[PDB]
Subunit: 245 residues, 2 copies
């Protein structure tokens, strides 16, 4: 089970911003496989007050991205996208539903994944103007506060958007690096979550971090593909990474 998240090395004001593209099992960065490079055909983007700008894939591994010019103190976003892919799917094999699950009617599903990282370059920077504005991700977690102001046990309010509208009753979960230490040699074991809750009518939910560290929140939404004459289903997996304390 491969998922997209974003990681940023701690930067000092006036340096190049370094980010990593998060493709696999969090939090272990892995090189993008040869048979998967077409999926990440567009580079990771840095969002500042000037807007969005692309980043340059350079480093010892092909998941490392750098800003072209250094960054001044502030609170910025780093965004990655799994470009839409298409796959065939059947349905069968449930515990006690029924053996004949619409007996092999195959359908098309479009998979899209997104990742957003809140990066505070200045160690004193906790601004909200940039990080609280949506960047247009089909499924998006928009922070309503800066993580630098959230202590352990406090509430970090985020909003879930699907196709530009708030998504109510959406399950958003959260984990951190070091919570679950079990190997990726047990079949496709997606990591345990240290938090889970559903969004309200405004698409908002308070993440309550019980530990400090590098946190990843995530939400997935499966829906009908807009143009049914091309494809039937659409799956979206979105993550938001941030530092607590």
């Amino acid at each position: 089970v491969h998922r997209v998240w974003v990681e940023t090395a701690h930067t000092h004001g006036g340096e190049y911003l370094k980010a990593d593209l998060g493709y696999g099992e969090f939090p272990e960065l892995e090189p993008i496989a040869k048979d998967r490079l077409h999926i990440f055909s567009k580079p990771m983007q840095l969002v500042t007050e000037k807007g969005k700008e692309n980043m340059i894939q350079r480093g010892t591994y092909n998941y490392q991205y750098r800003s072209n010019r250094p960054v001044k103190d502030g609170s910025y976003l780093v965004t990655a996208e799994y470009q839409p892919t298409f796959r065939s799917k059947n349905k069968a094999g449930w515990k006690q539903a029924g053996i004949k699950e619409m007996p092999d009617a195959s359908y098309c599903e479009q998979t899209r994944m997104f990742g957003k990282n809140i990066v505070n370059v200045g160690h004193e920077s906790a601004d909200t103007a940039i990080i609280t504005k949506p960047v247009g991700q089909n499924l998006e977690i928009v922070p309503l506060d800066n993580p630098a102001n959230i202590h352990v046990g406090e509430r970090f309010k985020v909003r879930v958007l699907f196709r530009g509208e708030p998504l109510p009753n959406a399950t958003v979960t959260a984990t951190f690096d070091g919570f679950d230490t079990s190997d990726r040699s047990k079949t496709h074991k997606t990591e345990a979550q240290a938090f889970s809750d559903t969004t309200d009518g405004k698409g908002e939910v308070d993440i309550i971090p019980l530990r400090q560290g590098f946190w990843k929140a995530s939400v997935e939404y499966k829906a009908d593909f807009p143009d049914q004459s091309l494809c039937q289903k659409q799956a979206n997996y979105t993550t938001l990474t941030f530092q607590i304390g």
Copy 2:
């Protein structure tokens, strides 16, 4: 959204085991309303070495139960059941945002709920003979260890059974008393969770508690009703309550 859980008072060897059927929103115990009495037509049960025995409904409120005899030191189970109720649902057009809508047709759904509490009577009591054996709940969480042996940040392994068989890929969440405290009655939603994961092929999952206190783990499963000539769907909500630290 009323759910079923079980609470037990701290018990020493030689006194009666006092327990509480919680029907509503964890962790607030409430009296079973007049129109809900038929649902809990059977008393809560105490499970010990000699097996399952009925508890006696004594107390100021109708959710309070007492063991028939004073209990000795050990590790026992207290089980409660929301008996099967039938209702009509039609999904005529409802509730939002991702798929088109509406295969308009009314159907029967059976609802059953279960709660189980691991009660360690007497300090140093951390036995596993009784609490690790299934009791026959249609959807059941069976602990594979005694929670007394589990410290904060460690792994408490449980197994999920549906109709006597392990249930893979089932979502088990976990929260504790005091994790989320607000919202008198506005929308009376389901509260935030401090843990969430999915069961493996053996139906097993490790709960990782980050805080001491009174914990509730929850799992739900919706499937087809066995005899389709009488009813179509079955919804099961199951809870396991335990102390950590």
